[PDB]
Amino acid sequence: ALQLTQSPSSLSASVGDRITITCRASQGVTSALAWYRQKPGSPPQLLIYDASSLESGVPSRFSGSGSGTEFTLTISTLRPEDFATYYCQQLHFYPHTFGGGTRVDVRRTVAAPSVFIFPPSDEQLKSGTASVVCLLNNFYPREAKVQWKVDNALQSGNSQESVTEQDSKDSTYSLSSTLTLSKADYEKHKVYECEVTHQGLSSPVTKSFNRGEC
Amino acid sequence: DLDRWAS
Amino acid sequence: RITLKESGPPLVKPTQTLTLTCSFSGFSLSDFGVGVGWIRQPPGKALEWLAIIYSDDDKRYSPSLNTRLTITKDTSKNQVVLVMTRVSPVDTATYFCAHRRGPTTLFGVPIARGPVNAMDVWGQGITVTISSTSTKGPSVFPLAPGAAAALGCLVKDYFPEPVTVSWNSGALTSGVHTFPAVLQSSGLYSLSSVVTVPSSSLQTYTCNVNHKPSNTKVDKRVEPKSC
């Protein structure tokens, strides 16, 4: 079906800035497009309907323009409540698609993550499972890539990660990634490595340990 | 198909 | 003033059928051209359109979910119901219903269609978790180690959300990061809580974990191993 692509997917800014988010459709949707702002924990809120009409009760700093395949939302003077995720929605064709969203967060200077690797506890091992956790602490911007390697084999499909919300004092994020293996598989290898790529790191940093080394 | 109010 | 609110089960098991109800006030589904739609949002993901129904009773569904969705209305009760069959874990999401305006009329004559281009009022959303799991308390394991040091606790295999974690009975707050839990393929949640301190403080560190659902409280003191 019809594709709606938002750009950028993520954007950093400060109070008072002017930002503009754009949304492009794969086929023309005339003026049937709406913009929403969604704050964490709340439902999306309508800002602009029919590509450019200002929804009633919505502050005038919000503006929408465009028609056909290209639309833009601009917030002229960013306020603290605007740090949020924005979505565009097409209503010309069924299904009524939503774009992927664009996250707007507090800009701060670039900060590389402090990385730490934790081996599984002997207590967990006795239960038969092995969790290897990697922590990326206080970094910025949000995008970071974690790659697990076991005896140099690239791992895939056996890890999960979660990211904290932007810190209200730091403006940084933290990320936890868990590699999970059976105790048996765990025992069949030695070098457990967490490789981290991030804008603040000149090149990838790797933190690792050799299993059973004591 | 076209939205209910399209065209 | 238009308001909508979603209701239904917070927890549902795979293969089961999920029935969600949207009860609203401020408009009638008998008003001209009005619509009520459903949109969902898996945790951390984008909004996804599901279906919509209009007062003249036309219905439309997401093509990807068409076979599992039924939307219906009960005009006299001011409710719209969405039934999703055969749910699986990927259906865990926050589900929202929303109002869609019909064209503006002048002396009962449609004169403006621009107002239909948006879903203008939304309900708060209802969180639905799809897992076969039964209530279960977490196993708590230690996570042990600019010149900052890090340690923590891995709160593993519990259900359902939420769990609370604090450090040193609430006295340790600076440098604490408790991450959002991930729903594992097993259907149980897992989360880590860590804390960063001056590489010298290694002071004592104990995480206090509490999973109300299963009556499981645990305090786990964590230290820099090696006996």
Side-chain angles (χ1 to χ4, degrees):
Chain A
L2 185 148
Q3 310 267 35
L4 271 187
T5 310
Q6 279 176 55
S7 298
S9 57
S10 178
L11 178 162
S12 43
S14 315
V15 173
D17 301 355
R18 175 170 264 79
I19 64 170
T20 70
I21 296 179
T22 123
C23 170
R24 165 252 174 193
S26 55
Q27 304 156 52
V29 295
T30 62
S31 67
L33 189 127
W35 291 94
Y36 306 86
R37 167 180 68 194
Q38 176 180 218
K39 310 179 195 187
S42 280
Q45 173 186 3
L46 176 54
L47 304 177
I48 301 297
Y49 69 92
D50 194 36
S52 68
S53 305
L54 213 211
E55 169 77 346
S56 169
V58 167
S60 66
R61 53 177 185 287
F62 289 100
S63 172
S65 81
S67 73
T69 56
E70 188 143 293
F71 307 74
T72 67
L73 173 72
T74 124
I75 302 191
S76 62
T77 291
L78 211 73
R79 296 254 278 110
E81 42 280 286
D82 300 337
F83 282 117
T85 302
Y86 291 76
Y87 293 94
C88 51
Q89 188 196 13
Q90 170 280 308
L91 294 93
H92 190 54
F93 298 111
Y94 286 116
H96 286 172
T97 342
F98 285 92
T102 103
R103 170 200 292 291
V104 167
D105 73 6
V106 186
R107 159 159 272 149
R108 62 144 283 148
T109 61
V110 176
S114 308
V115 187
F116 305 85
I117 196 183
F118 298 105
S121 81
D122 269 353
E123 205 207 325
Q124 181 177 208
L125 290 182
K126 294 183 182 199
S127 63
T129 295
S131 296
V132 196
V133 312
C134 188
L135 162 70
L136 278 56
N137 196 247
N138 304 350
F139 56 91
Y140 190 93
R142 183 181 197 287
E143 34 280 357
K145 157 161 179 295
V146 169
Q147 175 70 66
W148 286 101
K149 293 192 178 92
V150 181
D151 285 335
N152 285 309
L154 200 74
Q155 295 308 105
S156 174
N158 51 191
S159 67
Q160 285 186 290
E161 72 179 34
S162 68
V163 185
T164 50
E165 285 194 29
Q166 194 167 217
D167 184 273
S168 69
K169 188 163 212 69
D170 283 56
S171 294
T172 65
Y173 296 92
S174 291
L175 177 154
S176 184
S177 167
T178 301
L179 170 70
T180 307
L181 303 171
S182 61
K183 174 185 152 61
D185 278 347
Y186 181 57
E187 311 277 59
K188 298 189 169 74
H189 307 108
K190 56 176 159 286
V191 190
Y192 285 80
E193 322 177 71
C194 172
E195 195 195 41
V196 173
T197 302
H198 183 276
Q199 187 178 182
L201 292 174
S202 140
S203 60
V205 56
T206 293
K207 309 316 277 228
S208 58
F209 65 90
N210 285 69
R211 169 192 61 70
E213 204 156 82
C214 297
Chain B
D1 50 354
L2 293 167
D3 176 61
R4 184 171 185 183
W5 318 102
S7 179
Chain C
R1 195 195 159 212
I2 296 188
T3 63
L4 302 95
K5 180 172 284 189
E6 305 84 355
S7 65
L11 266 46
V12 180
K13 306 180 155 38
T15 66
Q16 292 181 161
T17 297
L18 167 75
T19 298
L20 296 177
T21 302
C22 178
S23 313
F24 53 84
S25 62
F27 68 91
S28 185
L29 225 17
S30 70
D31 298 334
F32 182 66
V34 170
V36 174
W38 280 96
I39 297 88
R40 91 222 288 205
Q41 180 157 234
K45 297 220 183 81
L47 294 167
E48 171 183 18
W49 189 81
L50 305 178
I52 184 170
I53 183 173
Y54 304 84
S55 76
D56 69 2
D57 201 61
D58 171 38
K59 294 153 187 167
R60 302 291 161 135
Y61 304 96
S62 153
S64 155
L65 289 313
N66 182 226
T67 59
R68 302 160 54 221
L69 304 173
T70 306
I71 182 171
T72 180
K73 65 190 210 271
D74 185 304
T75 313
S76 302
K77 290 195 296 177
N78 293 129
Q79 300 179 332
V80 168
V81 172
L82 180 77
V83 185
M84 173 178 293
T85 59
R86 300 285 308 181
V87 312
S88 90
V90 287
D91 296 312
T92 110
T94 285
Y95 287 76
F96 308 95
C97 58
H99 178 261
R100 185 181 189 184
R101 253 140 23 192
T104 293
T105 63
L106 176 59
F107 305 112
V109 189
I111 56 157
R113 55 183 186 146
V116 309
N117 294 322
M119 301 300 294
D120 66 339
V121 191
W122 293 59
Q124 61 180 24
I126 181 174
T127 304
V128 183
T129 303
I130 299 186
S131 173
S132 51
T133 282
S134 290
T135 298
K136 173 172 308 302
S139 290
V140 181
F141 309 111
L143 290 170
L151 62 198
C153 285
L154 168 63
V155 187
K156 202 175 157 75
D157 296 343
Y158 67 85
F159 191 88
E161 282 270 53
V163 68
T164 51
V165 177
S166 67
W167 287 82
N168 297 350
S169 315
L172 214 210
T173 47
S174 77
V176 174
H177 283 136
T178 287
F179 301 82
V182 292
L183 211 208
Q184 315 167 98
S185 61
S186 70
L188 296 170
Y189 290 98
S190 175
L191 82 61
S192 61
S193 179
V194 306
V195 54
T196 276
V197 291
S199 183
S200 63
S201 298
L202 294 177
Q203 177 71 202
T204 66
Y205 305 94
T206 156
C207 60
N208 329 103
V209 180
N210 191 188
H211 180 238
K212 291 299 286 298
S214 59
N215 307 292
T216 304
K217 289 169 70 170
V218 167
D219 289 313
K220 182 162 274 284
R221 176 160 181 290
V222 187
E223 47 196 29
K225 66 268 82 48
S226 304
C227 185

